[PDB]
Design a protein around this ligand. Sequence first.
Ligand code: ADP
Ligand code: ADP
Ligand code: VO4
Ligand code: VO4
Ligand code: MG
Lengths: 272, 302, 371, 371
Amino acid sequence: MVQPKSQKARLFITHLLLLLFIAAIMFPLLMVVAISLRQGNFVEQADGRITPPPFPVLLWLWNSVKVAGISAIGIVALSTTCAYAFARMRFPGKATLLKGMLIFQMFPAVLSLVALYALFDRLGEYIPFIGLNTHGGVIFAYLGGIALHVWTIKGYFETIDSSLEEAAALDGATPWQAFRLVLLPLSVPILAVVFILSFIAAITEVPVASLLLRDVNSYTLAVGMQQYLNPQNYLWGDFAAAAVMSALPITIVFLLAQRWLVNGLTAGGVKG
Amino acid sequence: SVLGLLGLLVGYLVVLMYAQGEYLFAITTLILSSAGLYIFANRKAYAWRYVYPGMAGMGLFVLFPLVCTIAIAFTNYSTGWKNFTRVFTDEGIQKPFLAIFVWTVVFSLITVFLTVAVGMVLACLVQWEALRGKAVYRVLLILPYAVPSFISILIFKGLFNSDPTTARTMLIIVNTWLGYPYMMILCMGLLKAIPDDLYEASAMDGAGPFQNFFKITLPLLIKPLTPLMIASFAFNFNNFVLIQLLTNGGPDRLGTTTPAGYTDLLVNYTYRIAFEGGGGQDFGLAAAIATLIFLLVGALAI
Amino acid sequence: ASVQLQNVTKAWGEVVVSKDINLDIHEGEFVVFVGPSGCGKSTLLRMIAGLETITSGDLFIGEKRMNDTPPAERGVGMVFQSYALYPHLSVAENMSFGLKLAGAKKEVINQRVNQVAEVLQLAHLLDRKPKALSGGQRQRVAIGRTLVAEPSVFLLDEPLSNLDAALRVQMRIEISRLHKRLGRTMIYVTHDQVEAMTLADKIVVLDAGRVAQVGKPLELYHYPADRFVAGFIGSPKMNFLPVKVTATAIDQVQVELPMPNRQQVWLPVESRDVQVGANMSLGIRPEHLLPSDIADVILEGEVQVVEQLGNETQIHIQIPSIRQNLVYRQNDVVLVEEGATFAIGLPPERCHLFREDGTACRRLHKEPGVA
Amino acid sequence: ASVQLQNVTKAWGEVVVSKDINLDIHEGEFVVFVGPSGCGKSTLLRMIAGLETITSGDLFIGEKRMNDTPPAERGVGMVFQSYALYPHLSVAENMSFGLKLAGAKKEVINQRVNQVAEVLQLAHLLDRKPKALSGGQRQRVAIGRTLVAEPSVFLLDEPLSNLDAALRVQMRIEISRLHKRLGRTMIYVTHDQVEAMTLADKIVVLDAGRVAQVGKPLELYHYPADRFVAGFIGSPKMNFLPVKVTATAIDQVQVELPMPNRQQVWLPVESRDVQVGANMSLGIRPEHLLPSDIADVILEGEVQVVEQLGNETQIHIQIPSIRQNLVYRQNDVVLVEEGATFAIGLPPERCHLFREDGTACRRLHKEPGVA
Ligand SMILES: Nc1ncnc2c1ncn2[C@@H]1O[C@H](COP(=O)(O)OP(=O)(O)O)[C@@H](O)[C@H]1O
Ligand SMILES: Nc1ncnc2c1ncn2[C@@H]1O[C@H](COP(=O)(O)OP(=O)(O)O)[C@@H](O)[C@H]1O
Ligand code: VO4
Ligand code: VO4
Ligand SMILES: [Mg+2]
C-alpha cells in the first residue's frame, strides 16, 4: 500500500500544526471586530442610507476588479510570450537583456511617482492609454511591465522536457503552433499562479495614484481606502469595511484559478 | 501592408512630438515604432517578434521613468556632479549610514530566508493528498493578502500595547506574516511541476517525509526560485511610501531618525534629507541618493 | 526473503490486469518474469514493491504480511523502466543516494560506488548529470544504484533493453556473480530468451494478468503445458499445424496431416481424453525439423522468405493447403532463393499435441537435461 | 531524400562524440546503425534530424545543405529513444497530431490512424493517455506516430527495445512491408543483430564517434575489417587467441599456436605486411568451431561454464595456454557438466587474422553468399 503506516499520527500532527498556524496568522487579520462594533458601517457601504464616498460595492469594488482582471490577463499573455521566447529560442543579446531586465526590475516609488506623473501629464495627445485620470489608460492594462512573471514562466518552461516540442517541431508544427498546442497545456499551472499573483498585486496597489484629479467618483478601491484614511479624524471603523470587502474578489479569483491547478501533467510522457 | 499603415498613424504622431518640442519623447516614440515595424516586417527575427511587446512595455513602464530620475539627479530641480560630491561628503550621517545599511541587509536576508521557508513548507503540506481540508486550508492561508498592507500595522499596534531589539523582532515577524503567501503560491506552482517518479524512487530507497523533502523537493525548487529570491531580497531591501505604521517615532537603533512609519530600510533613516526632495523639495538630492542606493544594491546583486 | 503471493488481484476500475496469481518464491531464488507486452509484469513488480495498491489477496514477504506496509519499509529495491533518475544529481550522487540516506559513512559508500562504477564500465562518467548521458548509460546508472543499495529483494525490470550484445553478456555475468555472492532473492523481468534461459531457477510466464506456467527453463522449452506458453518460449515461434486425430493407442495418439496425401504418424503423447476425430493442433519447433534426407512424411513446399543470419539460415516454406508458413532453421549459410521447392522432415518424437481449448497433451519422450 | 554527411564532427566542449564521419545514403536505402552503448548513434540521428547543431562538416538532404534549416522543413520524421509523447493527448490525438497540423481531412486522418493502429495492435488502447500505457504500448505509440505520418526520412531510434520476441518479429515484418510499399529512406538504430541482418541493405558500425566499416550485413559478418567490428558483429563474441608467426607464403600465413605442443597451421589469409616473428591475434567464430571427432588440430581444455539455451548449448572451455574462455556453440542439447575435459577442433580455413594495430588481413576464402 502506498499509504504509509501510522498515517493518523502524521495527519493529526499536521492538522494541529496547521490549525495553530491558521489561528496565529488570522488573529491580526480579525479586522471585522472594528467593523461590527456598529452594524451601521456595513456608513452602510453595502446598501441603505447615505455615505459621502460612493457605495464601494457598485463602484469602487467594480473598478478595482475590472482593472485587476484586465491587467492580470494582459500580464499573463505578455509574460508567457516573453518567457517562451527567452527560455526556448535564441536571439542576440539574450543574456544581456535578461541581466538588464533583472537589474531594472527593482525600483521604489520615491522616483516612480514623479517620473510617472511627468510621463502622464506629458502624454497629453490622444491615445487609448490616456495618461491622466482614465481608469482605462493608467494602471488598467498599463501595469503590464513585469519581470517576476517573465522569470517565473521561463523557469517553469525550463522544467518541462524539451523532447515534446522537439517532436512537435519534427512533425511540421511551427514554433507558434507548438507553443499553443503542447507547451501551454502542460505549463498551465504556472499561468494560473501568475494570474493569481497579478490579480492580487493589482487589487492591493496603493501607490501609483494617478487618478487623484477625479478622486470621488469611479477609481481604484485602494485609493478609495486611502481617501478614507483622513488626517483630521483617523476614521477607521468604516474604512476597514472596504478592505474586508476587497478580501472577497481575491478569494473568488483564487478559487477559480484553483479549479485550474493540477499535478502530473507531464506524467508518462517521456522515459529516462 | 496593414502593419505599414499602422506605423504612419504612429508616424503622424512623431511630427506632433517634434512640434511640441519634446525631442526625447520624439526620439523614444520613433525608436520604438521603427523597431516594432522592422521586427514584424522582417521574417528573420522571429524571437525578436516574440520579445518586442513585453520589452517595449517594460521599457515604457520602468526604464524611461528610471533614467528620467537619474537625469533629475544631475539637475537642481529647485548640476552634473555637485549632488554626488555632497552625498559623498555627507559625513553627518555617514557613520549611521553604514550601520543602517548593514542592519537593513541582514534584516532582508533573514526575512527572505524565513519567507521562502514558510511558503515552501506550507505549499508542500497543502500538496499532500492525505490532507482533507486542502481548499479551505489554502484559502485561509492566502487570506493575509486581503489587507492592502496599510492598516495591518494599525491593528497590530492596537493589539500590542520600547526594547529596540523587540522592535526589530516585530519588524521581521510582520514581514514574514505579510509576505509568506507570495512564496507559498509560487511554491505551489513550482510543486505542480515535479515528476512523481523521482518520489517513487526515493521511497524505494527508504526515504521518509523529511528526508524526501530535503533531498528532492528543496533542491528542485531552490533552482527556479533563485531569481525570485534575488528580486524579493531587493524588495525587502528597499521600500517606499506604503505599509508605514510600525515604530511610530524614532527607535534610534543606530542613531536613526525614523518617522511614524515602517520599513526603516535606508529610507526612513534618510527621509528628511530625502523624501519630498530632502524635505524642502531638493528632488535633485533625493534622486542622487536614490541613484546611489540603486548602484550599490546592483553591485551587491552581481 | 521468501516473496509469496496469494490470490493477488489488481483492478484499474473495471479492467483486471492481474487475476488470481499464486506465486511462491523461496529464499535466495532467481525468478524471471516473461510475458507479452502489456501482460502485467511491471504492475506485478510494483505491487510486490508497493508502488501500487493490492485490491484483493495477500502478499507475503519473509512470512510477514506486506499488503499495507509502506514501500520504504518493504525492504525491496526496484530498477524502474524509466530508470527513475534524479535530474539534479550527478552519476555518483545518483548511485550513492541510497547508502547516503541509510546512514552514510563517507568511506564505505565511496568504495562501493567506485567498485560498482568500475564493474559497470561507468568510470569516466561519474560526475555527469543524467541529461548528459545516453540511454544505455542511464539504464546502467539505474542498475548501479540498485546494486550499490543492498536490498533484500532485487526487483530488476528490463535493465538490459538499451545495450549492445557484448555489454548485455558482461552485465549478465556481473549479475550472476552478484547473485552467487549475496544469495538474495531476485525477480527479473525481461524480453530476451537468452537472458531468461540463462539466469533462472524458475520462470513465470504471465498472460493477460494470469500465470500460464511455472518451471525450469528446460522444462518450459521441452514440455510446455499450454499452447500460448509453447508459442511464447523460443525466439522463432513454433510452427503450429491444424490436424485431425484418427486413432489412439495406450500411450500414443496417431494423427492425420492436412497435406493432400494425408499421411498419418504416431505421436508418443498421452492418450487420456483424446477423442477420435478431434481437431488437434500439432506443433514442431523450427530447430527440430530435419532435412528431407530422413524417411518420413516429408512436407515439401515452396520457399517464400529466406533470412540470412550468418550463423544460421531461416527458411519460410508455404506448404500447400496450409494457412501459415513453416519456419525452418538450417545451420550455417545455405544458398536458397525464393520461389524454389524445399522439403523438411517431421520428427515424430519432437511434436507437441495441443487440444482445441489450448491445453497440451503431455509428452512421453524423455528429453535430455530435464529430470 | 538521400542523406549524406561530409566530415561531420560534433564536440561537446572537449568531448568529440563524433569525429570525421563520411556517410552516404542513396534514395530508398535501409541503413541500420549499430555500435557500442554510447558511441554516438543517437547523436548522429539527432544531428541528421536537426535537433542538434553540428560543429563542423555539412549535412546534405536531397542535395541541399541543411546545416541551418530548422527541423520543420527538413522533412525528417524521427521515432525517439525516449518515446516523446504528449501526455495531455490521448493515443488517437497523439498519432493524428502531425496530420492535424498538416490540415488534412478528418476522414483521412481517422482512416489512416485506424490503419496504423490495426497493425501495431493498439485498437483497444486507441482512447488512452500515455500515463496509463505500459512501456511496450508507449513504444508502439511512438512508432505508430511516424508510421501514420509519411516523412521522407525515417529516423527510428531503438524502436523495438521493450517488445517481446513474437511482437518484435511482427514489428520487423510490418516495418519491412512498409518500406517495400513506400520506398523512402529509413535510418535504423538497433542493438539486435537479428534485426540488423534481416532488415539492412547496408550496415554502419560506429566506434567512439568514428565509422569503423560500412557494407552489407553478410559482408560485415564474414569479412570484418578490424578487431572491434569482428568482436562486435555476432553474438557471442568471437574467440581471440594471441599467436606467433613462423612463415609467410605467397597467399597464406603460418601462425604458431600458443599451445605447449606448438601446432602450426597455415591460414589462407593475405600475406601482405607481415613479418616473421610478429605477434598477431587469431580469431575464430564460436559457431564455426568443429567437433573433435573429425579435425586436423584440436584445442583441448576443460569446461568452465555451460549455458543451456534449449535450441543450442554454449560451452566455455578454459584452455591452459590462452587466458580467455573458448566460447563454443553446439546444436541441440548436449549434457556436459562443469569440470569435465572437452576438446574441440580448429578449422584453419575459417579463422581470421589480425595485426597488433587492429587491421585484419583480408581472407582469401570464398565464403558463400557474399559476392
Ligand atoms: N550533453 C552531452 N554532453 C556531453 N557528452 C554527452 C552528452 N550527451 C551525450 N553525451 C555522450 O556522448 C556520446 C553520444 O552518445 P549518445 O548521445 O548517448 O547517443 P548514442 O549512444 O545512441 O550514440 C555518449 O558517450 C554520451 O554519453
Ligand atoms: N492506469 C491504468 N488504467 C488502466 N489500465 C492501465 C493503467 N495502466 C496500465 N494499464 C494497462 O494495464 C496493463 C498493465 O501493464 P503496464 O502497467 O503498462 O505494465 P507492464 O506492461 O510492464 O506489465 C497494460 O495493458 C496497460 O496498458
Ligand atoms: O542510445 V545507446 O547509448 O543504447 O546507442
Ligand atoms: O508494456 V512493458 O512490459 O514494455 O512496460
Ligand atoms: Mg514494464
